[PDB]
């Protein structure tokens, strides 16, 4: 018999006054962090949906946020051209990272969490030292806005994606390009991420398509379709707490879930009233966090038995 999860809405979290841009579960699984165009970052209880606190400081909208390995720090990417490192406990800004000449769009800590990688509209990828806040390297990674940046599991690699239609893998230590995985220019690559085991790369293009690439071989293994995505840089995820699924937001206001192997859509989550720009999968539970744009502004938490 075949398996299909049965995610069902547990909570709806309201509070942001503008479209939500990104949601991320703390590695320890107790928190859900959310960023919004309202220039705020809010902290919520992953299991009770209970609002915890608001963290402010950016002068403009935030496009992305990311947790440190110990769930103690948070880094944010904003249109004010800076990234800010925050102490979640106190909610205060520890460092403001300055260098980008345009909107900072994406960010991530490396597994060690002593480094931060950022992607900007200025077309560069920058690597920052967490303790000092100094910029160690600036990579002329692309010829158009950088949509995503992510470290592989041992932190030796960085994967970037861009509107220039490319996906490049970089050597963290040297900052040199190890490979241009997606070579065609156009369609815009709106999102990239390494698989939990660091062997694959999940990439989304603005042609309603998600693809699983075998990094070492440089070849496409799986394609996932059926959802809508031609306008926004939507976050996509690997779900491995139960059945191995591919999770993603969509421009038709729903959350799509695919069987990773068969590539078949196994469930579509309804409830949001606007584009689901971001989705996140709990690190230990079969829980999904989803967030929507302007006509919704809410974050929904879903749970299944798998």
């Amino acid at each position: 018999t075949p398996v299909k999860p049965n995610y069902a809405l547990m909570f709806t979290l309201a509070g942001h006054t503008k479209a939500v841009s990104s949601v991320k579960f703390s590695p320890n699984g107790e928190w859900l962090a959310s960023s919004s165009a309202d220039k705020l970052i809010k902290i919520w209880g992953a299991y009770d949906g209970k609002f915890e606190k608001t963290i402010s400081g950016h002068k403009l909208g935030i496009s992305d946020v990311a947790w440190s390995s110990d769930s103690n720090l948070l880094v944010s990417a904003s249109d004010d051209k800076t990234l800010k490192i925050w102490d979640v406990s106190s909610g205060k800004c520890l460092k403001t990272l300055k260098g980008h000449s345009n909107y900072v769009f994406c960010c991530n800590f490396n597994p060690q969490s002593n480094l931060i990688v950022s992607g900007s509209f200025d077309e560069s990828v920058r690597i920052w030292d967490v303790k000092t806040g100094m910029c160690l390297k600036t990579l002329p990674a692309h010829s158009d806005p950088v949509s995503a940046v992510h470290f592989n599991r041992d932190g030796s690699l960085i994967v970037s994606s861009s509107y220039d239609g490319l996906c490049r893998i970089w050597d963290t230590a040297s900052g040199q390009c190890l490979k241009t995985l997606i070579d065609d220019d156009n369609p815009p690559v709106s999102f990239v991420k390494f698989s939990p085991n660091g062997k694959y790369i999940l990439a989304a293009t603005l042609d309603n398509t998600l693809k699983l690439w075998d990094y070492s071989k440089g070849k496409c293994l799986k394609t996932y379709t059926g959802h809508k995505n031609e306008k926004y840089c939507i976050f996509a995820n690997f779900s491995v707490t139960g059945g191995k699924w591919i999770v993603s937001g969509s421009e038709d206001n729903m959350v799509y879930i695919w069987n990773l192997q068969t590539k078949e859509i196994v469930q579509k989550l309804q409830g949001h009233t606007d584009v689901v720009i971001s989705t996140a999968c709990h690190p230990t539970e079969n829980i999904i966090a989803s967030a929507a744009l302007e006509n919704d502004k809410t974050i929904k938490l879903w749970k299944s038995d798998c």
Partner: peptide, 5 residues
């Protein structure tokens, strides 16, 4: 601005 096109 990830929220805008």
């Amino acid at each position: 601005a990830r929220t805008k096109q």
